[PDB]
């Protein structure tokens, strides 16, 4: 394990946020690692000193050391290698998730939280099996294109771009990250996209998602901060720290 990113000592931070970038040097494709940069940027704006550790193959993971886990996407080969190492982190990630701490998981990382995924060529690769969803393959087809979803628990809309062959089906104890307004979503069948279970937020969205959805960036960081320091603290407003991004998100229309 090593620290890949650290806030400067150019501000006086009242809080500390430690991010475990799971397999961040193997699951590192398509710009999804820019989610880490967006987490750091939002956290600093809220007064948090950010430390990002790369926790990858053969690293031990201690749930108590981290306030956010980010688990992104990668290439098929790297993804199968990540899968081989995950049993070493199963017990600690299960405890982290059961303790309601914050996870953001994208593509392959989202898939690997679940039961298994199946490559396009039919090979089943077991996942952590912590969550109940599973992912089937498509023989030739891929779900590719712009996608827009809406989460009715929060009343938030998220936009991005999908490109995946896997078809994920959620288990009964899970919610979707959002219901599909247009796009294929997890399976093209049930209008779901992603997952929301406790404080695990999963998605197929490229973008990166937090660059295109600052609403979700704020949600993840504030949830993490209130989890660590308690629901009674008073954080700066979404509109006040992210005014520029909220308006420019709309100017795109």
């Amino acid at each position: 394990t090593y620290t890949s990113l650290k806030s400067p000592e150019n501000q006086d931070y009242i809080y500390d946020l430690t991010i475990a970038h799971l397999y961040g040097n193997l699951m590192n494709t398509y710009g999804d690692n820019g989610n880490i940069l967006m987490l750091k940027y939002v956290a600093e704006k809220l007064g948090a000193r950010v430390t990002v550790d790369i926790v990858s193959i053969n690293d031990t993971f201690e749930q108590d050391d981290y306030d956010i886990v980010f688990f992104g996407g990668g290439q098929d080969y790297e993804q199968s290698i990540v899968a081989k190492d995950l049993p070493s982190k199963k017990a600690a990630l299960a405890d982290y998730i059961a303790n309601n701490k914050v996870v953001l998981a994208i593509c392959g990382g989202f898939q690997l939280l679940g039961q298994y995924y199946v490559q396009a060529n039919g090979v089943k690769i077991d996942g952590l099996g912590i969550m109940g969803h599973y992912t089937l393959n498509q023989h030739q087809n891929r779900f590719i294109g712009d996608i827009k979803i809406h989460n009715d628990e929060f009343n938030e809309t998220y936009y991005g771009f999908e490109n995946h062959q896997g078809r994920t089906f959620l288990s009964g104890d899970e919610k979707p990250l959002g219901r599909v307004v247009y796009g294929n979503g997890n399976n093209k069948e049930d209008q779901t996209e992603g997952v929301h279970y406790k404080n695990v937020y999963g998605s197929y969205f490229h973008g990166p998602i937090l660059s295109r959805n600052v609403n979700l960036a704020y949600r993840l960081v504030t949830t993490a901060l209130k989890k660590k320091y308690g629901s009674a603290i008073s954080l700066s407003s979404y509109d006040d720290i992210l005014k520029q991004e909220i308006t420019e998100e709309y100017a795109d229309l």
Partner: protein, 393 residues
């Protein structure tokens, strides 16, 4: 035959790999010419190869040599048509699986098992598989440090023997350098051609020593040093004298081109194309070396010729801008909003990042800035548009 008997008359060098094919070919041709006279080559490249060999002024009793750039995918086919004497492998990187792309050139060289392969030893791919052909390696053998991980956005860093993560006693860029697996001690081979000294490197030039002789090129970028290294290595292999390599190198170094420089008012400007993460990070690492204050403008379009997807900018190493003498930043192009956000996230002073909806405005701003120099990084259609607006003045 249409291309077969010429492989018996000619010593044919095939230059292949992901990047640097054209420049490595052009520089190699120019050095070989100093030693051997006319060199057949394809300045832009199979039936068209027939005319190149047919224009040849040399006859059968003279030393006939061809240096040909062949695309990685076209190699198994052409290796049936003509038999090279030497393969040169510049590098392999991912299009937007690399092990499948490496398989094609392994196959193409297998079709000429007697031909030597001259590979970039600094790429761990080029030591991933056992090979029939004789192999020699060129690479950087400057001072080493303790093994350290490459940057976490680097691709292709798994050990091909044990699937652990490679580290580097020296990392030039991407996954290149003196790699070492700390689990099974797989590691970069002994280099037959050594860059032993980097003696000076700037935003617009470099000087280095290769096998006991010093060379200078007039463009920045480590990737260009690799191109000179490979060519000089080919010339040493062909037994060219150090004096002739130097003279051939100095006659042919202009194929490197120059920085695209121009003027806006009293400001000196350089325009640089960015199109993928490794390329953009190499440009930022180059301009970081400039020894003067400068403005930075970054122009992002998402048109067809740019690549409709702009997610790649999040993998480029824009964090480097906090370590540069940048006086002010301009964010332009159609996606000026997304690039402005990419730049804010580095922690750079957001009050010095200015969005412009029209490239003309970028020109007016650079025109009135306090600093004497301006760097402009631009995607493709943004670069064409920016040049066209300069025409109208």
């Amino acid at each position: 035959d249409i291309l077969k008997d010429l492989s018996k008359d000619y010593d044919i060098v095939v230059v292949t790999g992901t990047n640097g094919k054209t420049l490595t070919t052009a520089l190699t041709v120019g050095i070989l010419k100093e030693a051997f006279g006319e060199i057949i080559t394809n300045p832009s490249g199979i039936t068209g190869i027939t005319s190149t060999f047919l224009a040849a002024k040399k006859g059968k009793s003279e030393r006939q040599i061809a240096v040909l750039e062949i695309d990685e995918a076209s190699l198994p086919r052409i290796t049936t048509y003509l038999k090279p004497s030497l393969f040169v492998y510049t590098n392999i990187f991912r299009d937007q699986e690399i092990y499948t792309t490496y398989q094609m050139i392994v196959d193409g060289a297998r079709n000429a098992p007697k031909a030597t392969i001259l590979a970039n030893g600094d790429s761990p791919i080029f030591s991933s598989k056992d090979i029939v052909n004789p192999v020699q390696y060129y690479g950087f053998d400057t001072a080493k440090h303790a093994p350290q991980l490459a940057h976490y956005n680097t691709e292709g860093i798994l050990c091909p023997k044990c699937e652990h993560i490679l580290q580097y006693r020296l990392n030039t860029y991407a996954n290149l350098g003196d790699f070492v697996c700390l689990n099974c001690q797989f590691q970069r081979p002994t280099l037959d051609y050594q860059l032993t000294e980097l003696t000076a490197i700037t935003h617009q030039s470099s000087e280095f020593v290769i096998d006991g002789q010093n060379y200078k090129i007039n463009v920045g970028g480590l990737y260009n040093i690799y191109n000179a290294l490979a060519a000089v290595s080919v010339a040493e292999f062909f037994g060219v004298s150090p004096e002739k390599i130097k003279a051939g190198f100095n006659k042919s170094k202009a194929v490197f081109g120059r920085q695209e420089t121009f003027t806006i008012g009293d400001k000196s400007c350089t325009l640089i194309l960015i199109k993928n993460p490794v390329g953009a990070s190499q440009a930022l690492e180059m301009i970081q070396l400039a020894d003067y204050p400068f403005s930075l403008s970054v122009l992002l379009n998402a048109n067809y010729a740019d690549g409709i997807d702009t997610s790649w900018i999040w993998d480029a190493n824009f964090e480097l801008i906090t370590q540069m003498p940048i006086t002010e930043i301009n964010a332009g192009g159609v996606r000026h909003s997304e690039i402005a956000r990419r730049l804010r996230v580095t922690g750079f002073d957001d009050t010095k990042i200015k969005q412009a909806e029209k490239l003309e405005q970028i020109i007016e701003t650079i025109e009135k800035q306090e600093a004497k120099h301006a760097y402009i990084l631009a995607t493709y259609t943004a670069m064409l548009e920016f040049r066209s607006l300069l025409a109208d003045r």
